[PDB]
Amino acid sequence: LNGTLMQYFEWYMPNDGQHWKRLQNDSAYLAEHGITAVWIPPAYKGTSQDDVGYGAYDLYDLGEFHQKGTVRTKYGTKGELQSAINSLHSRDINVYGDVVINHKGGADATEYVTAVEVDPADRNRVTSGEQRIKAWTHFQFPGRGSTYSDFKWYWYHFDGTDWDESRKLNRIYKFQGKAWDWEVSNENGNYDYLMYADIDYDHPDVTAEIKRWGTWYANELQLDGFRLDAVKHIKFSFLRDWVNHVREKTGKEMFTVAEYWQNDLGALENYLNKTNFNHSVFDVPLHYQFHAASTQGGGYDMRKLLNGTVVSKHPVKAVTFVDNHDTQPGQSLESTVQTWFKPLAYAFILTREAGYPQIFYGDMYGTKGASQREIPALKHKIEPILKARKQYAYGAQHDYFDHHNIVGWTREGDSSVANSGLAALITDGPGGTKRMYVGRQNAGETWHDITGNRSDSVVINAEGWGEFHVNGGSVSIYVQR
Ligand SMILES: C[C@H]1O[C@H](O[C@H]2[C@H](O)[C@@H](O)[C@@H](O[C@H]3[C@H](O)[C@@H](O)[C@@H](O)O[C@@H]3CO)O[C@@H]2CO)[C@H](O)[C@@H](O)[C@@H]1N[C@H]1C=C(CO)[C@@H](O)[C@H](O)[C@H]1O
Ligand SMILES: C[C@H]1O[C@H](O[C@H]2[C@H](O)[C@@H](O)[C@@H](O[C@H]3[C@H](O)[C@@H](O)[C@@H](O)O[C@@H]3CO)O[C@@H]2CO)[C@H](O)[C@@H](O)[C@@H]1N[C@H]1C=C(CO)[C@@H](O)[C@H](O)[C@H]1O
Ligand SMILES: [Ca+2]
Ligand SMILES: [Ca+2]
Ligand code: NA
Ligand code: NA
């Protein structure tokens, strides 16, 4: 009954073309552990075979055409992906496709383009006269031809680029007659430009094409929803319209979550307001609180976890998470939740009633970067918490955020899920005890810590209270034996 997402990739997975097959093979395990949706990495051809998927060369090449030195994407072929999806669907696991429509990388050829430089800290400020540059803006798709779409891209479908091939130079170039799109993040004056060739969402052929591709992509992979990439950099009204368009065409709900990367609830609320609340956002501020708590050695005030997050104010529109492919060690938003704290963060997202929680592949199975700082596989510590969510985290919640270190919450259980109910404690410092109310309806039950961190049993008194224990820097989640 509780819904649980999984981001089914991390940055450093090996480029062996076996990921879709792995996902197919993991579908029974995922279903068994209560995963109800997976967010899959971008499924279309990037700038090379080892592209993680954000390069976005050809949105109509799902590992089907020999383009960029490969047929398969990093993850495998279209057919392998489709077989993975049909296995996931056979166990009622929904699939959300990653949508990378800010830009296009790896153009087939350059074009001579008139441009001006802009200031990278203030892209509204022009910093050169007009100059002739050689931009990677011509997309012909020679391996695909016109199969599925005859649409070709040229410089006038884009607002700019970050590379002039003639002078061999990295700056932000805005093309002649173009304007940065609005509304976008006001960071750096206007944050339309991010990388590669930036798509011009003022162009009516582009808006039409991307909407049409959206429907095609949904059909081709039988997607149940979307993860929207880089939404700070894409006209907000367009994103709103695109989501509405695909929903209208498919006739499906198409649950959507956007990645608006800002550690600021106000900025996220503005984005939600400008997209009419028609989709969810990742709870970026909550991720940063977990990171802060995990790095402050008990000095963090754990009461802070209740405030300043998307889940605290718009729980229906929050997708909560601990880490992702950008926050993992070595990556561009590095702010990793330290190993010791990571199960406590998972208890917070998985066993509390607010938010749509997401588990990270890198946390479950470890990350495969080349450092000695990789996330170890924490499957075995996360599994009991997943089970707590699947079987026990139902009914009315009571919060006990009344201490700098030891905080907890309870769930009374619901008569629709037999034996449901839980009492969770986490602490970023010394352990201890807390008396918490779990419901008079649970009076006399004997509860035990599903994580196995504590071996003691707790008998719920006549008044519906138990005395629950937690170890130092630990988590305990008590449920009925
Ligand atoms: C990879 C990521 O890049 C972009 O994110 C940038 C943020 O927009 C900036 O605001 C800034 O973030 C800082 C925070 O504002 C601040 O709270 C601070 O504590 O640290 C943050 C890191 O400096 O810098 C970010 C990094 O440039 C972009 O907005 C975001 O969407 C990007 N993530 C996705 C996009 C792409 C491109 O398709 C992929 O490379 C990623 O894997 C995606 O997940
Ligand atoms: C999985 C589900 O997550 C989202 O909905 C959940 C909210 O995020 C939670 O906060 C909670 O909502 C309650 C509020 O916390 C509370 O303040 C009060 O307003 O009552 C709310 C309703 O009880 O619980 C919600 C789940 O009931 C998200 O909005 C929703 O779209 C998500 N559902 C999709 C997911 C799956 C599979 O994972 C599909 O089966 C569904 O069809 C999708 O709709
Ligand atoms: Ca853009
Ligand atoms: Ca524009
Ligand atoms: Na643009
Ligand atoms: Na603390």
Side-chain angles (χ1 to χ4, degrees):
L1 195 163
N2 283 323
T4 307
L5 243 167
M6 180 163 182
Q7 171 176 10
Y8 207 86
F9 64 110
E10 62 92 11
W11 190 269
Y12 296 106
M13 292 188 321
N15 177 28
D16 64 3
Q18 299 312 299
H19 193 56
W20 301 141
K21 291 177 138 184
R22 283 181 192 116
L23 176 54
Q24 180 164 359
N25 291 334
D26 217 14
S27 63
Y29 171 89
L30 296 168
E32 177 54 25
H33 295 262
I35 300 305
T36 58
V38 299
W39 152 34
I40 46 159
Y44 24 80
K45 198 61 55 67
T47 70
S48 66
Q49 194 190 66
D50 71 4
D51 197 314
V52 171
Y54 299 102
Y57 165 75
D58 189 8
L59 300 183
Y60 288 103
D61 178 2
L62 298 169
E64 189 177 351
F65 301 98
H66 197 290
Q67 300 195 119
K68 304 291 165 192
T70 178
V71 178
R72 67 167 180 83
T73 63
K74 183 178 170 174
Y75 305 115
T77 65
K78 182 175 89 178
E80 291 162 354
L81 174 54
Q82 292 169 328
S83 298
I85 292 167
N86 100 37
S87 286
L88 289 161
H89 286 152
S90 75
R91 294 137 171 118
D92 211 21
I93 298 171
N94 288 3
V95 179
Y96 307 153
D98 210 323
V99 172
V100 184
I101 62 174
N102 174 62
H103 57 258
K104 296 183 75 58
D108 299 303
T110 57
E111 291 182 288
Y112 286 101
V113 180
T114 298
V116 298
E117 189 182 341
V118 302
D119 174 351
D122 184 1
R123 287 84 164 287
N124 295 325
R125 188 93 116 72
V126 174
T127 54
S128 76
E130 297 191 320
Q131 43 181 311
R132 205 72 169 153
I133 67 167
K134 256 164 83 89
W136 290 105
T137 53
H138 187 193
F139 294 73
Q140 279 293 305
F141 313 113
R144 182 165 58 78
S146 292
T147 305
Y148 310 131
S149 167
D150 68 5
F151 191 100
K152 311 300 186 186
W153 300 70
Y154 306 88
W155 71 270
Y156 52 72
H157 297 131
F158 302 104
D159 279 325
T161 188
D162 62 359
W163 183 262
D164 170 27
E165 191 68 19
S166 66
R167 298 175 188 74
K168 315 268 177 62
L169 205 42
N170 183 231
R171 358 283 319 185
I172 306 182
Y173 299 97
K174 184 179 83 196
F175 298 163
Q176 188 176 52
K178 298 300 193 180
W180 302 122
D181 300 336
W182 183 257
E183 191 177 347
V184 293
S185 177
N186 62 27
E187 197 172 320
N188 304 308
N190 170 296
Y191 218 162
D192 192 16
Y193 189 79
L194 179 69
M195 63 183 39
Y196 296 118
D198 188 69
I199 290 173
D200 180 13
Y201 284 107
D202 300 314
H203 195 120
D205 297 340
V206 167
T207 59
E209 170 49 32
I210 295 296
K211 287 170 185 179
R212 185 265 208 202
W213 165 79
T215 303
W216 180 89
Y217 182 50
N219 291 345
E220 208 71 6
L221 298 182
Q222 302 287 287
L223 299 177
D224 305 290
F226 299 115
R227 177 271 188 183
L228 304 179
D229 185 56
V231 300
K232 283 173 79 173
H233 316 285
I234 304 169
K235 184 185 220 154
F236 300 161
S237 68
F238 173 71
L239 292 169
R240 180 196 65 200
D241 291 343
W242 185 93
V243 174
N244 285 341
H245 182 93
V246 180
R247 288 170 176 172
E248 203 276 329
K249 293 291 172 165
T250 61
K252 297 171 70 152
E253 174 188 323
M254 307 302 289
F255 178 87
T256 297
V257 53
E259 181 237 9
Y260 193 109
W261 201 268
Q262 203 89 70
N263 185 19
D264 186 75
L265 177 59
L268 294 162
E269 286 174 328
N270 177 64
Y271 176 81
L272 292 168
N273 280 102
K274 300 291 170 63
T275 56
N276 297 162
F277 287 76
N278 80 2
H279 63 272
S280 291
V281 288
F282 289 117
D283 201 343
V284 172
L286 181 64
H287 161 77
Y288 281 105
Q289 293 211 45
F290 292 152
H291 170 262
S294 77
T295 49
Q296 292 179 29
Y300 193 77
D301 184 353
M302 293 283 282
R303 295 172 283 215
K304 293 180 157 157
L305 294 170
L306 303 189
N307 312 130
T309 60
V310 183
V311 74
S312 70
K313 288 304 208 192
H314 304 282
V316 176
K317 298 281 156 177
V319 175
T320 52
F321 71 105
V322 182
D323 272 305
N324 69 26
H325 67 294
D326 295 325
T327 67
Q328 68 182 96
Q331 281 310 117
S332 43
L333 308 175
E334 190 185 69
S335 49
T336 304
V337 179
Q338 302 301 106
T339 320
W340 74 272
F341 192 79
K342 180 150 276 171
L344 290 57
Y346 273 113
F348 190 96
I349 72 169
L350 293 169
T351 66
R352 300 178 54 76
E353 69 88 11
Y356 187 175
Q358 175 177 280
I359 75 170
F360 179 43
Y361 183 106
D363 295 342
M364 290 288 283
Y365 307 139
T367 58
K368 297 190 168 193
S371 83
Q372 301 303 311
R373 324 198 180 215
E374 302 302 315
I375 302 167
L378 296 174
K379 196 172 77 233
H380 293 324
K381 295 182 198 171
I382 296 164
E383 279 170 347
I385 309 175
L386 283 160
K387 187 173 166 170
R389 183 176 178 77
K390 189 195 186 188
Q391 293 172 41
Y392 296 104
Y394 301 90
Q397 181 165 304
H398 305 276
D399 283 347
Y400 297 89
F401 283 69
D402 52 19
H403 193 268
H404 193 260
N405 306 334
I406 302 164
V407 297
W409 54 94
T410 64
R411 303 294 295 283
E412 296 189 16
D414 190 274
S415 63
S416 79
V417 183
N419 305 119
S420 58
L422 63 80
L425 288 167
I426 62 175
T427 177
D428 68 340
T433 62
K434 200 190 299 295
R435 302 186 64 80
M436 295 185 293
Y437 176 75
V438 297
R440 273 169 303 281
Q441 67 272 36
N442 298 311
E445 293 180 1
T446 305
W447 287 22
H448 83 299
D449 179 7
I450 202 172
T451 70
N453 289 333
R454 295 291 302 198
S455 65
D456 52 286
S457 282
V458 178
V459 181
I460 305 313
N461 74 13
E463 299 81 25
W465 295 75
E467 185 168 278
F468 302 103
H469 297 241
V470 63
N471 288 328
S474 195
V475 50
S476 290
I477 304 172
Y478 294 81
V479 300
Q480 190 175 18
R481 284 191 176 284

